[PDB]
Amino acid sequence: KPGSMYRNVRQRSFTRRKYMGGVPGSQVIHYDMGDKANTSFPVKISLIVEEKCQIRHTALEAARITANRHLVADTGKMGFYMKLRVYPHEVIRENKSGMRRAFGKNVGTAARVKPMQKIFTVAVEKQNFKAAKEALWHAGQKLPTPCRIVVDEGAELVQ
Amino acid sequence: MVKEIARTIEIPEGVSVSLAQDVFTATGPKGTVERKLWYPGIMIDVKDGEVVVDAEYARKEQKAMVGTFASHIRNLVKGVNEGFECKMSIVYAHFPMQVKVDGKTLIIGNFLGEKKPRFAKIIGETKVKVSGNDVTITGINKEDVGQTAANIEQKTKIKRFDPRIFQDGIYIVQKA
Amino acid sequence: VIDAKGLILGRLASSVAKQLLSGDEKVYIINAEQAIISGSRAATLREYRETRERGATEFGPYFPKRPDRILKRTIRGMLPYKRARGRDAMSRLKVYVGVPYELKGAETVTIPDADMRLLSSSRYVELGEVSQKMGSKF
Amino acid sequence: MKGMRSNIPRALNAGAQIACVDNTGAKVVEIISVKKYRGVKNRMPCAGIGDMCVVSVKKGTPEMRKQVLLAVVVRQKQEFRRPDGLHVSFEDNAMVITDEEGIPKGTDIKGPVAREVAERFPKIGTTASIIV
Amino acid sequence: ARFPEAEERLLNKKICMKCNARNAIRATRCRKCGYGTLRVKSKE
Amino acid sequence: MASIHRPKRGSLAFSPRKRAKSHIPRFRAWPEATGEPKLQSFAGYKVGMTHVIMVDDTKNSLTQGMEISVPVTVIETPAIRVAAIRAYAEDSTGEKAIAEVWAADLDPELKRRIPIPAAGNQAEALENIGKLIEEGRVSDVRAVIYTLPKSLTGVPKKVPDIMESGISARDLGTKFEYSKTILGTLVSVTDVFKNGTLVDTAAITIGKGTQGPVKRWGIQLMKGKHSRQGSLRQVGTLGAFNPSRVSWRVPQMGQMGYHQRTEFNKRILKIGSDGEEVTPEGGFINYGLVRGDYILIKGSVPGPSKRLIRLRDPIRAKKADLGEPNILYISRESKQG
RNA sequence: AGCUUGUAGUCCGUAAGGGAGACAACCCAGCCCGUGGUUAAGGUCCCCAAGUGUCGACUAAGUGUUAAUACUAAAGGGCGUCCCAAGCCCCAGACAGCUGGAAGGUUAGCUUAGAAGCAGCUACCCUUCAAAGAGUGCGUAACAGCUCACCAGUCGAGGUU
RNA sequence: GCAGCUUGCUACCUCGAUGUCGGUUCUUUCCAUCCUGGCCGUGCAGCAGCGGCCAAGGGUGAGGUUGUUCGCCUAUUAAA
RNA sequence: GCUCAGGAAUAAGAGCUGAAUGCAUCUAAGCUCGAACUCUGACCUAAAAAGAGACCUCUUUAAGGAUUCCGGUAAAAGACC
Ligand SMILES: [K+]
Ligand SMILES: [Mg+2]
Ligand SMILES: [Mg+2]
Ligand SMILES: [Mg+2]
Ligand SMILES: [Mg+2]
Ligand SMILES: [Zn+2]
DSSP states (O other), rough: OOOOOOOOOOSOOOTTTTTOOOOOOOOOOOOOOTTTTTTOOSSSEEEOOOEEEEEEHHHHHHHHHHHHHHHHHHHHSSSEEEEOOOOEEEEEEEEETTTTTTOEEEEEEEEEEEEEEEEEEEEEEEHHHHHHHHHHHHHHTSSSOOEEEEEEEEEETTT | OOOOOEEEEEETTEEEEETTTEEEEETTTTTTEEEEEEOTTTTEESSSSSEEESSSOOOOOHHHHHHHEHHHHHHHHHHHHHHHHEEEEOSSSSSOOOOESSSSSEEEESGGGGGOOOOOOOOOEEEEEEEESSSEEEEHHHHHHHHHHHHHHHHOOOOOTTTTTOOOOEEEEOOO | EEOOOTTTTHHHHHHHHHHHHSOOOOOEEOOOGGGGSSOOOHHHHHHHHHHHHHHHHSSSOOOSSSSSHHHHHHTTTOOOTTTHHHHHHHEEEEOOOOOOOOTTTTTBOOOOOGGGGSSSSSSSSEHHHHHHHTTTOO | OOOOSSSSOOOEEETHHHEEEESSSSEEEEEETTTTTTOOOOOOEETTTTTTEEEEEEEEOOOTTTOEEEEEEEEOOEEEEESSEEEEOOOEEEEEEEEEEEEBBBSBBBSSSOHHHHSSSSHHHHBBBBOO | OOOOOHHHSSSSSSTTTTTOOOOTTSSOOOOOOOOOEEEEEEOO | OOOOOOOOOOOSTTSSSHHHHHSSOOEEEEEEEESSSSEEEEEEEEEEEHHHHHOOOOOOOOTTTEEEEEEEEEEEEEOOOEEEEEEEEEEEEEEEEEEEOOOOOOOOOGTTOOOOSSSOOSSSHHHHHHHHHHTTTOOEEEEEEOOOOOSSSOOOOOOOOEEEEEEEOOSSSHHHHHHHTTTEEOOGGTTTTTTEEEEEEEEEEEEEEEEOOOHTTTOOOOOOOGTTTSSSSSOOOOOOHHHHHHHEEEEOOOSSOOOOOOOOEEEEEEESOOOGGGGTTOOBBBTBBBOOOOOOESOOOOOEEEOOOOEEOSSOOOOOOOOOOOEEOOOOOOOOO
């Protein structure tokens, strides 16, 4: 089931789970990676999507896995802090007959993100800026939107 | 500092470079050579034993073209003055190649045991000499000498076998 | 008598078509093999072999091969040649490979705005090269 | 294969039940296909003298019967011409069991073999009593 | 055996990992497709 | 759909399959000169077929050295007359005839084809052609020849057949000199072709009139139950639904035979002068007997008996010098047996 | 979905004429008849009335020459080319080439008789030195000439992210 | 993402009828290439493979079951 | 019975020279090779090619054509010889 199905935003939100029934649980396990009790990381880069889209929980999990693997391999187990900012709140549904009673059944969850919205933020030391940049580039390849990396803190510390 | 696109070519004594029409002609002790060098936006001037190639504009294409034209002019004057020599080596494992010149072609017989000899073409007034187990290629044109050496090396290509075992052929050891 | 040497094919064709539709002269075009088509050689050859090999045999387009016939066809597409005015215009046009013996020594003219030295690059081919790569003997 | 000097019509097509004329225990074999024969649409595989065919032993011993074997046709009733213009025809069609190389499985061949198979397969020639 | 002058021309080039094209020993990018990763041609 | 494939029925290399526009074959190409000047073509009349026993001299053949029976076509080849010299000018639009000089004396039966050119300008016409050659206006010279079938008896016609023949020479001046030598003479087939060599034969093939697609293109018949449902010798379909038309490549009825055909690499096995050497007992059926000099061509030739066969030196021959054949026996037995 | 079902405006339906190649409903325009004039939309190389128009750039792909459009291909990539900006190095001589040394460390420990710097897990390895590491290569059953990361001189201008 | 060659979805055309499936016959096209031609890589010694690129000129068959399409099986075949 | 090629220009690709980018670089210009593809070459057809052709011969109350006649190398009628 391709991500192009539940990708475009054409509809209102579908998030009130007390008026629906049976939502499959999200695949994304953690939302904070690296060293969670460190705040004195001078450089902080984030990945912002540049289109209004819906990101499925499986896409978020895939991007998170790839970025976390790259960061752990390059900077080490606690050489970085990584935050997945958005939670999949939207419930995705599918119509599984034809068009009669076509209101779908819940098949997953997605995060409805806006243009220029931060998806992932990574904090590292000065020497790991390019590694964090590379990891976030790999993470954005798993997402259904074009992305761009921005430096939030420590711009003068990289160039 | 100041970027200059124009390039200067010195004309050694005995070399009479002319640029009538859009064709460049160089005459020297080793012979005479003539090449076509035309490209819009590039200008070539011959003056006082010195050719200068300049472009009207300064974009990357004009920079590349002035560089290429200056290199061609320098090679032409060198060819009319000092010429070019290209060295190739004859290597074989089991079958001794029979290599000889029959005019404007090089006969490569018994290559890998074949009953039909190979034929490599000579370009221009290029001088190919089989110096025993090696081949020397000389001429006034760097284009012609390079192409003649390339023809010799490409004609001796083992086109199906593993290159790490079958290595018979004639290979350039020094370019023009 | 227009000398087609070093002239853009479409611009020469447009000029000659308008002149023929101004309805006062017979136009002769010589050296049609020496007309120029701007653009890379691969693209022009690809498009001309696509046009040459297109139609149906009982029906389809019969795109010519001779450079003079190709040039006449190029002018033909800028005329209302199915109309009496266009038919009259096409009857007053003669295109030649080289110079015909009768027109030898006649005073020729050239269209200044169709000149190929107004092009900014060297990406061009002559019409004769296209014709001979399509298999035309001339 | 090596060419014969004569022109042989491919007289037998697939399904033909030919008498086997060697001492291998096969009495009647049926042609299944013809080796080195590519056909065309709707054309049955065709075999004349000198051709090797895949056959099925229809009659003979129980050991031989129902076996897919190779056989070479050595006689054919359809007339074929020798190089000097003479046309030759036999009274019947005959084959002998062989391998891929053309070596007979049997040891004696009852009846005459065509000279063409005798040259194309020398062992069939030596095994045969008379070559016509 | 193996002649070094032949190995210079036969085995001393890089290979594009996406199109397999031969490239110069010093090339960092494939000329045919522009791929950024090139491996030396395997001489063993 | 999973489809069974079949090569297309017949050749589209001879389309449209219409009647030949003349009873004479016209040569569209002429080979290159490889020796002394001579005519590149000859014309005879097909008599019939016989066979010879010859020693196989073909190199590398399996039957080389032994006696083989070879079918041959006998072609009567009386001397042709060189009627005219024609000069051609090459330009962008191809060759054009620029000059012609006719021989002063021409055969009286030539009037059956054309009004006879007079014995007028031959020296001045020849000098005009010489001037045209000197000034560069002439690209090549051809010889206009005609046959004289009156000497034959199996061919009923007395009206000559006129055709242009090339001259093979190394240079245009040599061609003009040779043509002036041969102008108005009678050339024998030995002056054009030598025994044992390959030639190309052109003729109009046997006419069969209007024929169906089964015979004309070799389409399949309807098979099995379809053989007796009313369309036995008819093509299965004329087309698809789209395109909405019958393609010209669909096999259809029409004229069969009486086309121009050229055969390649037909070997001359004997140049003869005595027609009794080849005429069988009882004569050739529907023809009679050979009277003048003849030629034996190995194998078959296009056309029926009495058709004009044009012989030209080969344009795509492969084998080198073949030799003189050793004909041990020419069969003169009755073709009527 | 040129799907289905709402809503506001406006159309076609029932809307000519002008223009978009043709176009129910897209643009101008709502239209009594005739004549003259000037415009609208749209266009001005020819087909085709009017620009082979002007200025300043870009594109090399015949890309394109497609208002809306049911009639128009994405993610991803490009030392293709043209721009803007910010770091770092730079005539106290960069960037890439041409030359010149990689001499004291160690043959650092590794079951099996053998990978003694490229299986391998670890360093304030030299006093100090313009200059030599627990190692970047076709190569070694246990050693080696032949290539680097480095300061040196070289012509001499920008280089790099 | 492409295609529209599977099956769906849909109800725009056709109910004063556009004759169904499969096969057969004949013609044609596409290329996303099975063989044949040319190439590149290889964990390519040769033989032979595996992977990929160009290329649609020619070829791509015969049989047993089954109405089959599809598929299975047989023996040939350069490939079927 | 006959049924080849050869040449040209290319695809992928392999190279030469070559700058942008001092070096290097098959490429950005330029150049050499490179397929059963394409073109040419063979072969069939083709003055109804509207630019509706060239040349020669014969003759302008003729040249010559058709019809009738005897036929067949042709032929559904015509046509063709
Ligand atoms: K088909
Ligand atoms: Mg509206
Ligand atoms: Mg209504
Ligand atoms: Mg209304
Ligand atoms: Mg309207
Ligand atoms: Zn590549």
